[PDB]
């Protein structure tokens, strides 16, 4: 299925702080995310324009009386396009057990144990028989604040790389041009510095420096 999102970079930590402060009345939830990535040493998926990710996540306001495991989501993102602050990608995703996700980080060959349609599709589309030639590329931490604002769900990200923090606003929408205009009008009125995001979080990670 096609995932479509507005993607804007917040230019400073100060801009990000101003935004999260102003959006506090609209807060829905806060997610702590760890993103991990998988490819061959020869970058076979990356060269075929595919990204294979395991995301581990927890809701920051999870019940203290009723603990639950972190969630683990496997995703395949294919044929991405990112321009003019709009991201479009073919995406397949599935939830998997936390313990198996953790084991796949250390041993990518164990991705075959899951029996996921997502991973089945990786094998079928790109001509892999298994995940024996795969490594975990490592990954990074993201704090995602989610807001219900003017008919849309806003995601405000603080991505914490080894080389520094990056700040973004995202919005998953079937009407990206209309929604981008609405977000930008708000940011402009509030003087919150921004530009189009020209790189995915994974691309920034791989580059090893701030965009
Ligand atoms: Mg995104």
Residue numbers in the entry: 0 to 210
Sentences reproduced from the published study:
The Vtc4p β-tunnel domain is not unique to eukaryotic polyP polymerases but is a structural hallmark of triphosphate tunnel metalloenzymes (TTMs), whose characteristic features are the presence of a topologically closed hydrophilic β-barrel, the preference for triphosphate-containing substrates, and for a divalent metal co-factor (PFAM families CYTH and VTC). Members of the ancient triphosphate tunnel metalloenzyme family can be found in all kingdoms of life. Our comparative analysis defines that most of these enzymes share a common catalytic mechanism in their tunnel centers, yet they have evolved different substrate recognition modes on their tunnel entries. The observed substrate plasticity apparently allows TTM proteins to act on a wide array of enzyme substrates and to perform very different reactions, many of which likely remain to be discovered.
Instead, AtTTM3 has specific, Mg2+ ion-dependent, short-chain polyphosphatase activity as previously reported. As AtTTM3 efficiently hydrolyzes PPPi in the presence of Mg2+ ions only at neutral or basic pH, we used two crystal forms grown at pH 5.0 (form A) and pH 7.5 (form B) to crystallize substrate-metal complexes under non-hydrolyzable and hydrolyzable conditions, respectively. In both crystal forms, we determined structures of AtTTM3 in the presence of PPPi and either MgCl2 or MnCl2. At pH 5.0 (form A) we find a triphosphate moiety bound in the AtTTM3 active site. Here, PPPi coordinates a Mg2+/Mn2+ ion that acts as a bridge between the substrate and the invariant Glu-169AtTTM3. The same metal co-factor coordination has been previously found in a Vtc4p AppNHp-Mn2+ complex. Here, the octahedral coordination of the Mg2+/Mn2+ ion is completed by an glutamate residue (Glu-169AtTTM3, Glu-160ygiF), which is invariant in all TTM proteins characterized thus far.
